[PDB]
C-alpha cells in the first residue's frame, strides 16, 4: 500500500525470459513506398560483441548491402539506411524482405522483417441525382495479397472546404462499407454535406 | 530389372528435382555453398562419395522436408523417396547390401530454427538440396561404389 503503513505483499512467482543471439531492433518496420529506413543489429559471437566494422548486411541471403549505406552509429550496433524504398516484390509466400546482418561472410538464421506494402487505394465519390447521398467506391485488387488484414474507411468531415493539401486528422469517423459484385466496397453517407 | 534404364531413370529424376527448386523463386537468388548458422544440421556440400552416404543424405532431407507446410516441398519428398528406392535397387544389382536410412534422430532441435525464422531453414534446406543432388549426379557416372 502507497499510503500509510502497509503490508508487503508475497512475491508472485518468478518469471524467466530467454534472448536469442543476435539483437535487431527495431525487429519490424511497416513502411510506405519512397520512405527511409534504418535498422540497426548487434550480433554476439561466443558471448562477445562483434565491432562493427565487421558487421556485413545481406538482403534475403541473395547478395550483399553496399558498404554505402553501412553506417557505425557506435563500436557495437551497426545500422542501415534504406532511401526511396520500393515496393517489395512477394517471394512466394513471404511478402516482406529479410535483412540479415553478419559477422564476415559467415550469416547468422535471424533476420529483419521489412513490409512495404501497396496502400495507394483510389476512392471515388459520387453524388445521386437528387444530391440526398454520396456512395465512395474503392478497389481492393492491391490487398488481396495479405491474410488477416482489416480495412477501414476513416473520413473527417470539415467545417468548410477542402484543404489545399489534404492530411490525416488524429479524430476521424469510421464508416461503414459493403462489398459490391464487382469487388469494390461502397460506402454511403446520408445525408451529406 | 534393366540397370540401364534405371540409371537414366535415376539422372531424369535428378534433373527434375532440380527444375523444381529451379521454379521456386526465392532458392534461386540464394547461395548454395554459402554457410548460414544453425543450419548447419542440414547435410550440404560435403563430399559424398559413396551409396550409403548418399542414402543417409536423402534420408534426412526427406524428414526434414515432411515437417514444412509446403505443396511444392510435399511432391519433392516423394521424389526423393522414388530417388532412394531407386539407389537400393541399383545397389542390388551391384550386390551391395543398403541398411534402410532411418532419418536424423536429432530433429528436437530443428523445431527451434523452424519456429524463429521459417524463411531461412526453408530457402537454405531447398539450395543446399539442390547442390546435393547436382553433385550426387556428377558422380553417377564415376562408378560409385558401396
Known sequence: ?193 | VPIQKVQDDTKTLIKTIVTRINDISHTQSVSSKQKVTGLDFIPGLHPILTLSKMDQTLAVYQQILTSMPSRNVIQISNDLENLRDLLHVLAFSKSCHLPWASGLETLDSLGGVLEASGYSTEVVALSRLQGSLQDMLWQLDLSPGC
Not at chain 1, 77 to 95: A, D, I, Q, W
Not at chain 1, 123 to 142: A, F, Q, V
Open chain 1, 1 to 193: 500500500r502507497l499510503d500509510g503503513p502497509g503490508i508487503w505483499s508475497d512475491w508472485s512467482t518468478p518469471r524467466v525470459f530467454t534472448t536469442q543471439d543476435v539483437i535487431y531492433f527495431p525487429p519490424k518496420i511497416l513502411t510506405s513506398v519512397g520512405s527511409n529506413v534504418s535498422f540497426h543489429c548487434i550480433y554476439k559471437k561466443e558471448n562477445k560483441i562483434v565491432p562493427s566494422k565487421e558487421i556485413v548486411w545481406w538482403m534475403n541471403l541473395a547478395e550483399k548491402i553496399p558498404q554505402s549505406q553501412y553506417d557505425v552509429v557506435s563500436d557495437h550496433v551497426s545500422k542501415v539506411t534504406f532511401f526511396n524504398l520500393n515496393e517489395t516484390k512477394p517471394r512466394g509466400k513471404f511478402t516482406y524482405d529479410a535483412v540479415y546482418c553478419c559477422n564476415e561472410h559467415e550469416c547468422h538464421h535471424r533476420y529483419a522483417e521489412l513490409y512495404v506494402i501497396d496502400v495507394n487505394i483510389n476512392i471515388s465519390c459520387e453524388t445521386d441525382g437528387y444530391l440526398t447521398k454520396m456512395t465512395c467506391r474503392w478497389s481492393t485488387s492491391t490487398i488481396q495479397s495479405l491474410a488477416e488484414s482489416t480495412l477501414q474507411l476513416r473520413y473527417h468531415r470539415s467545417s468548410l472546404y477542402c484543404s489545399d493539401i489534404p492530411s490525416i486528422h488524429p479524430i476521424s469517423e469510421p464508416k461503414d462499407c459493403y462489398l459490391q459484385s464487382d469487388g469494390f466496397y461502397e460506402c454511403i453517407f446520408q445525408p451529406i454535406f
